[PDB]
Amino acid sequence: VLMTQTPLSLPVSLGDQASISCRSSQSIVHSNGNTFLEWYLQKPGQSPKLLIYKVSNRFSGVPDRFSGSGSGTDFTLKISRVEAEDLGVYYCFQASHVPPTFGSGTKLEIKRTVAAPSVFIFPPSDEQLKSGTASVVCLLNNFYPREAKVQWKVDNALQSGNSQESVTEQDSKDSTYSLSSTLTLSKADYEKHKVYACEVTHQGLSSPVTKSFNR
C-alpha cells in the first residue's frame, strides 16, 4: 500500500493555511469499518509525533488548528493559522492493511522576509596545523531564503573540489537557516598562500560580501 504525498514541500506564511494531501495505492478501509489513516509531524531533532488518527480524530493535546478529512483513497491534512513551531516533516500513515506503511513526507517551510546572513571566517587552529591539515571555516548565520552561494578564494584564485557545506533545518524562533562551509587544504598548500577569502552571494545582499583574513 503505497502512500504518496503532495506537495513534497510547502512554503506558507504565518497565519495562513497549509494543505497536504495523501493518496493510497488501494483502499485503506479495514474490513471493520474504520479506516486507520494517521498524520505524524517530525520536528527538527525530534521523534515523529501523532497529530491525527482514524482520519479526522485529533490526538490529545493537538491544537484545533489541525484537521483531517478524506475518503477511502484520498486524504487531506489542513493547518490553519500556521505558527513557526509547526515547521518540520508531516507524514501520513496507514495501518489498515499489513505491512503498515508511511508516505515519504512533506516539508512545511515558514515563509518570512529576506534576511542577509551574518558572515564570519575562522582560520585553521594552530593545533590542526601541527597535525598536517588546514581547515578554514566560513559561517553564514541566520538568513532567508535557504539558497546561498559561497565561493572560497585563496590569493584570489577561485577554489573547487576542496570544500564541504551543510545547512541547518529551518529554525523555529525566527524561521531562518544557517550554513557552514569548510575549505580543507594541506598544511603545505595553506603555508604557501596569503589571502583566505569567503565570498557570499545572497538574495538579501545588493552585492557580495567578502570576509577575509591574512595568514
Added chain:
Amino acid sequence: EVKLVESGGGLVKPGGSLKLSCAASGFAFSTYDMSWIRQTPEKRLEWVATISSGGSYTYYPDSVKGRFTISKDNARNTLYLQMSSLRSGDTALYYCTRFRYDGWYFDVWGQGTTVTVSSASTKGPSVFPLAPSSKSTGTAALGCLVKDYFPEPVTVSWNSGALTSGVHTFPAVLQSSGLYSLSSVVTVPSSSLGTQTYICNVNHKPSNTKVDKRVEP
C-alpha cells in the same frame, strides 16, 4: 509520565548481529503491543516489527523476516529487537513505539538509536576550536570543528547543556576520504569574551571518544 528510552545502537559489520533495547516507564507496559520503526538516511519511515501484549504473536515485514527478533521483558518493562545477518540496508535510526489498540496508532516514541552496518573500522574525531576574533565579529561567533570520524552520530553540547541560544550544530558532511566532519557554532556578546567560559562537549560513542574543548579568543 510516559517514556521510552532506547540504547544499544552502534557500528556493526555486514553479517553481524546486534541487540537494541528500549526501557519503558510510566505505564502498564505489558498490556500494549509495541513496535520498532526505522528511519533511513533519506528520512523514510519503515515499520520493522510488532509484538502483541501477550508476546504470542510477532509480525515482521518481508525485508527483515528470518533475521530480526522482537521480544519483551515484562518484569523490567523493556522492549528488544535482536538483529542478525545485518546488511548495508539495515543502517538507520531505530525507534521503539507504543501501538495503542483502539485507533491502532503510535502514541509514544523513543528518542532513537542509530545502527550503522559497515565494513570499515570506527575512527574517533579530532576536535579543533573556532576562536572568536575581529573576523567573527556586538555579537561574536565561536565554535568547535569535529573532524574525520566514522560512523555517525556525534553529539555536541555547549557548557554541558547550559548554553543553547544561538547554538547551531550543523549536519555532518562527508569528506572525500569517506569520513564525516561536523561544525557546532554559537554566537555570543563580544563583551562576554574576556569574562565568560565557552566549552564544547563532544561525544562519539562508537570510538569511546569524549572531549571538552575550551574555546578562547
